[PDB]
Amino acid sequence: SSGLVPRSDDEFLRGKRVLVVDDNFISRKVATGKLKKMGVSEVEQCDSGKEALRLVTEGLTQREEQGSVDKLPFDYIFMECQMPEMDGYEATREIRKVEKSYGVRTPIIAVSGHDPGSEEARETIQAGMDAFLDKSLNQLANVIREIESK
């Protein structure tokens, strides 16, 4: 159902910027709606691993160039694991490589319709995801509090 990966709630994410990455238009609106109801300050949504990598790449650059107080363009990224073309593992890997250069690490939570198997669990770690969540997102608040202890 949900958990960490080794290396009322309506103000729960107030102050937060989130990116939702999901190839499925309906899933995607549901995710962003759920996040809005938790008081999220900005939700950004995109439909592909490549778009996500773009938005994070440009966001990091922009914040660096402006000397922004917050250097992360998103406090959390929810990343669909299985997507055509660049899946969420590969996107996460590329995000981690883009971030190296800034000395930052965005919390990236893998979203999946099923519990990972061996090989997906292995990809989850190698990619550098922080946590995993089933696509209902029921445990989203939980998982985000876990990440914040860490």
**Resolution in units of Å:** 2.0
- 112-134: burial string, b at 16+ Cβ within 10 Å, e else: beeebeeebeebbeebbbbbbbe
Experimental method: X-ray
Q: What is the count of structural domains for the chain?
A: 1
Name the residue range of residue 125's domain.
1-150
Q: How far apart are CA 48 and CA 124, in angstroms?
A: 17
Secondary structure of residue 7 in the 3-state scheme:
coil
Q: How far apart are CA 95 and CA 106, in angstroms?
A: 9
Beta bridge partners of 131: 4, 109
Q: How far apart are CA 18 and CA 35, in angstroms?
A: 8
For CA atoms 112, 118, 120, 122, the dihedral sign is: positive
User: Residue 14 sits in a domain of what CATH number?
Assistant: 3.40.50.2300
| DSSP track, 16-31 | -EEEEE-S-HHHHHHH
Q: After which residues is the chain broken (C to N over 2.5 A)?
A: 7
Tell me how crowded residue 9 is: count the other CB atoms within 10 A of its CB. Answer: 11
